[PDB]
Every structure is written in C-alpha cells, then in structure tokens.
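Quick one before lunch.
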Amino acid sequence: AQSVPWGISRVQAPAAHNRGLTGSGVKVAVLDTGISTHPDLNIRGGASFVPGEPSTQDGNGHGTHVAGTIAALNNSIGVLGVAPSAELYAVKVLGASGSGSVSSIAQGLEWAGNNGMHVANLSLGSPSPSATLEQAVNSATSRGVLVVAASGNSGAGSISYPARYANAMAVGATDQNNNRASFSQYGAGLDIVAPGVNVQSTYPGSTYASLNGTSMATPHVAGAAALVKQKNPSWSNVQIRNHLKNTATSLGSTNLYGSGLVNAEAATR
Ligand SMILES: [Ca+2]
Ligand code: NA
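Model of the calcium ion complex:
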C-alpha cells in the first residue's frame, strides 16, 4: 500500500497529477548527502564532490529523505513525491555527518549548470556569507537552473546562506495548522513556505522515516517547480519562481511566510 504524506496533500500535488503533470522530462539535482538506492526511487545519475567519497550513495539518510519528497514513485508501495516522474540526480556535496564545505557546494552548483539541470534543491545552509557561494548561485542561475534552498532551523529572524542570496529561492517550513514552524528561519529574502513538520519519506535501508526541518519544506517547492516546468517547458527559472510565489496561498506577513504556502494545483491551473 502507498501512503500520501500529509505535506504532499497539503501542497495539492495530487490535483496536478490528475491533470497529467508529474514532472516527466524535468531534471532535478539534489545537492545533499547523496541518494541511496530504494524501491520507491529512480536515480538517473549524479556526481560526488566530497573528497575521498566517490559514490553518490547516502551515508547519512538526509539526501534520500529529501529526494523522496520530490520524487518518490507513484506505485503500490511507500510514499508519493510531489513530482513522481522527475529525473533525479544525486549530487553529493555533504559528508555523512551532514557537514560540507563551500567548495563542495559550489562545485555541485557548477555541475548542475553544466549538465542542464532545471532545478537544484539545496536542503542545506551556511551561517556566514561566502562570495564563492554567491557566485556559484549566480552562475547556475545565469545558465538556467532554478536554485531552491532552505531558510534554516535556528528559529531566528534572518535566513541562512545561500537562501539569503537574491538568486536562490528561499523556503521556510509550516506545520499542520499552516503556522510557521517554531524552528523555521524567517526575515528578509524569504520567498515561500511549505510543510516541514513530521514529513514521512524514503530512507536508506529500504525503509521510511519522519523528519522535521526546513530541509523537508524545500523539496516540496523543488517538486512543484518541476510540475510547472512540465506544463510550461519554455519558461525560465525566473518565470517559474515568480509563478510559484504568485499562486501561493497567502498566510500573512511576508516577513514570516514570504508569499505563503506553495500550491501545486494553483500553479498548474
Ligand atoms: Ca510509492
Ligand atoms: Na533568496
């Protein structure tokens, strides 16, 4: 039996699926700890930028979980992603502890731009600005990639990097009441929010796990972008970003919520 996690329903992904929009033909790079083989995922390729770790398999779990929120397969098992037909690429930029470097993240963004990815999901952050990170975001954006990044989990009224940079779409987290989750960073630069509490998804060992974080909100938006790209294959990264914001359900102050809750039904109408 397949379950539909609450966040997938909350962003109205099944309504888009009923229109025939699943993310087919859209290339999504997951810049994370890797992605492990799993019966409910189909991984098309990828690359590792972590020294001495040549495989894209996930030694942590975080990247596999993020990947399943984007693209867990629509079948009779497991869960269901926002964009179950998206082409997933594992770009390993974080080590098994969840730590990375600016150099590994920047190289992953360069790879995404050079390999024609449509969306890059960055469920990660750094507390300090880095010109190398900013340049890599700008370079990927100029090449055509939509960069989607987590606002961070510190609870503070500023958002992490690279989400804070203008050319990254910054995603915060909501709970089941459509309130901002207490940990979700907010403030200047926040674009949109998505479910980020008690998110069930794929996990290494052919299993499933529930996690909390802005890391879990971000892939709902990356998946929604893939649905919009399938419907509108000529649209640019900037057009998709603005359309997601324009069709979001407002939740109140833009300082706390950005444009509001991502809505895949409204975005694909
Ligand atoms: Ca499934
Ligand atoms: Na931003």
